[PDB]
Design a protein around this ligand. Structure first.
Ligand SMILES: [Zn+2]
Ligand SMILES: [Zn+2]
Ligand SMILES: [Zn+2]
Ligand SMILES: [Zn+2]
Length: 241
């Protein structure tokens, strides 16, 4: 009964939210399709979904379609490497140099003599948008040798599968199978996003048209914002608020 689509970064928390909400409102069903931020935003603009989930802010034109926004969490973006890469700390400008193809071998960062396998998300990813904005490069500048992975799960799998890969992903997906680098000497933790020392972060938004949001969908968003819903955000390695 409540259709939600969009961000892959938001998918794990939204699924957790839905299952917990099922105990509060058993007669509501929440349908979640993880297709990336831009597509979920467009589905909300077009009335295809009741709620869009985004992991970037709206563009002015998306806003103009009459979309309200509700911030449900903040989220860090980790730069992940394969486990046991000797490079454990990068400055934002080093990251920019990698993603624009200026630096191409891990030795240029003090690592192994090996080519860097640069991994980017697909066009329309909210993580890609925020990452590029913060690191400080345009889509035009992304190295032509970048692999493109479609969705959070795929970027993690690529990095898991290649010793020399580097990718970016929501903290929600980071586990012991990959290594998040320090950024500018700051560990990639929800605590350091909260205290503003970890610089790569972005909101999670639920977006909707007031005309389309049902009492069930409003209920669900209110639950996510509740004390219990915000504990679920924290458990998914996000930042409350
Ligand atoms: Zn906004
Ligand atoms: Zn390995
Ligand atoms: Zn609590
Ligand atoms: Zn976990």
């Amino acid at each position: 009964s409540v259709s939600i689509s969009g961000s892959t970064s938001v998918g794990p928390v939204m699924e957790a939210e839905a299952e917990a909400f099922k105990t509060k409102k058993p007669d509501v069903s929440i349908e979640i399709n993880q297709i990336g931020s831009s597509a979920g935003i467009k589905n909300a603009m077009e009335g295809v979904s009741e709620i869009g989930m985004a992991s970037r802010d709206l563009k002015g034109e998306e806003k103009q379609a009459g979309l309200k926004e509700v911030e449900i969490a903040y989220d860090g973006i980790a730069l992940i490497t394969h486990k046991n890469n000797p490079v454990k700390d990068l400055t934002l400008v080093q990251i920019k140099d990698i993603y624009t193809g200026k630096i191409t071998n891990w030795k240029e960062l003090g690592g192994n003599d090996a080519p860097i396998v640069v991994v980017s998300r697909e066009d329309g990813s909210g993580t890609r948008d925020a990452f590029q904005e913060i690191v400080g490069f345009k889509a035009e500048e992304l190295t032509v040798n970048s692999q493109i992975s479609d969705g959070s799960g795929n970027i993690k799998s690529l990095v898991q599968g290649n010793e020399n890969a580097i990718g970016y992903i929501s903290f929600s997906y980071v586990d012991d199978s990959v290594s998040a680098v320090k950024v500018d000497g700051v560990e990639a933790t929800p605590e350091n996003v909260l205290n503003k020392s970890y610089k790569v972060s972005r909101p999670f938004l639920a977006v909707y048209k007031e005309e389309n949001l049902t009492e069930s969908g409003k209920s669900f968003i209110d639950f996510i914002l509740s004390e219990e819903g915000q504990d679920i955000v924290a458990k998914e390695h996000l930042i409350k608020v």
